Amino acid sequence: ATKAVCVLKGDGPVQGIINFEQKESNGPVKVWGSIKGLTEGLHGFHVHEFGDNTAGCTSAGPHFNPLSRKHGGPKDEERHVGDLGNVTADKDAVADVSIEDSVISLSGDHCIIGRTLVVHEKADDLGKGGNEESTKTGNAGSRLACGVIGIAQ
Amino acid sequence: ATKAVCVLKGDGPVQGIINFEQKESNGPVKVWGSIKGLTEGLHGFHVHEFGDNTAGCTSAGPHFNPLSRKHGGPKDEERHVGDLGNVTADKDAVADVSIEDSVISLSGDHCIIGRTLVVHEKADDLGKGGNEESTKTGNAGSRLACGVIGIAQ
Ligand SMILES: [Cu+2]
Ligand SMILES: [Cu+2]
Ligand SMILES: [Zn+2]
Ligand SMILES: [Zn+2]
C-alpha cells in the first residue's frame, strides 16, 4: 500500500498538503488534503509531466499524458492520466480535497511519483469547451501553486 | 536515459539546484549543480528515504537504505544507497557539486526519484566516527536544506 505526498507552494497565498494512497497495485488512488488561500469556487487540479520546479510551476510541463489522449474530467474515459478535474474552495478560501481516482497510480506506466501536482487560477472546463485549447489544458488558467509528488510512509 | 532534478530549500539561506543524469538503466548517475549560503567546509549530502517535506527536512526520514546496510562513504563497500558523502563550500559560501555514483539509480530497485536530497550542517564522518550514531547518520548534524527529487525533461 504505497503512499505519496505533495506540499503545494507558489508565489501568492496558495498553500497546501495533498496526500495519495493506493492499497493495491490496481486499486484506486485516494487523494485528500486541504488547500488554503484560494478564491471561492472551482480550480483545475492536475498532475503534470515533470517534477521540475526550477522555474516554479511553469517548469512542470504539460498535463501528464503517457497514453497520448485528449484532456477531460476525471470520470471521462477520454482524459490525460493527470486529469483530476476541479477542487472546490469555500468562502473561507479553503478547498478540502477528497477524491478517489482510477487512472493515476502509484506504480506502472500511470505512476505519478516524481511528477508535479498543480492547482490553477480558474475552473477546468473538463475538455468540453468549443475550442481546441479545451482539449489540451481545460482552459484552467495560470498555475497558482505546485509541488513534487514524493514517497511518504 | 533519464534526468531528474532537485531544488533545495530550508529555514536559513541554503539553496540550490541539483541535477541528476543516468544514461543507461542501472549505469552510473552524474550528480551536479551548485549550492549557496553554506559555511565554508564540508557538509554531508544524502538521499533520505521519504519525499515528504510537510514538516520540512525533518519529515524526510532516515538515509535511503533498501539493502539494510550501515552508513559509509560513497566509495565504501558498506554504505546506504543514499550515502553521497560530503560537498565542500568555499569562502564565498558556494558548493559546486559534481559526483558520479554507481549505487543510486533513476530506475529499478535503487531508484531515488520521489525521495529527498538533504545537505547537512557539518561533515559526514563517513561511518568511521567510532560510535553508533556514526554507523547510522555519519554525525552530519541538522538538515540545512532539502528537496524532493523529481523527473525532468
Ligand atoms: Cu494543471
Ligand atoms: Cu542526510
Ligand atoms: Zn489534461
Ligand atoms: Zn547513510
UniProtKB/Swiss-Prot annotation, chains A, B:
The modification N6-acetyllysine is found at K122, K136. It is an enzyme of class 1 (oxidoreductase). GO terms for molecular function: copper ion binding; identical protein binding; protein homodimerization activity; protein phosphatase 2B binding; protein-folding chaperone binding; small GTPase binding; superoxide dismutase activity; zinc ion binding. InterPro entries: SOD-like_Cu/Zn_dom_sf, SOD_Cu/Zn_/chaperone, SOD_Cu/Zn_BS, SOD_Cu_Zn_dom. Its EC number is 1.15.1.1. Cu cation binds at H46, H48, H63, H120. This is Superoxide dismutase [Cu-Zn]. Pfam families: Sod_Cu. CDD domains: Cu-Zn_Superoxide_Dismutase. Belongs to the Cu-Zn superoxide dismutase family. Keywords: Acetylation, Amyotrophic lateral sclerosis, Antioxidant, Copper, Cytoplasm, Disease variant, Disulfide bond, Lipoprotein, Metal-binding, Neurodegeneration, Nucleus, Oxidoreductase, Palmitate, Phosphoprotein, Ubl conjugation, Zinc. Disulfide bonds join C57-C146. It comes from Homo sapiens (Human). GO terms for cellular component: axon cytoplasm; cytoplasm; cytoplasmic vesicle; cytosol; dendrite cytoplasm; dense core granule; extracellular exosome; extracellular region. Its cofactor is Cu cation; Zn(2+). The ditryptophan cross-link at Trp-32 is responsible for the non-disulfide-linked homodimerization. Such modification might only occur in extreme conditions and additional experimental evidence is required. A lipid is attached at C6 (S-palmitoyl cysteine). One of its GO terms (biological process) is muscle cell cellular homeostasis. Changing G16S: In ALS1; sporadic young onset. Changing F45C: In ALS1; slow progression. Changing C146A: Exhibits very slow copper acquisition.
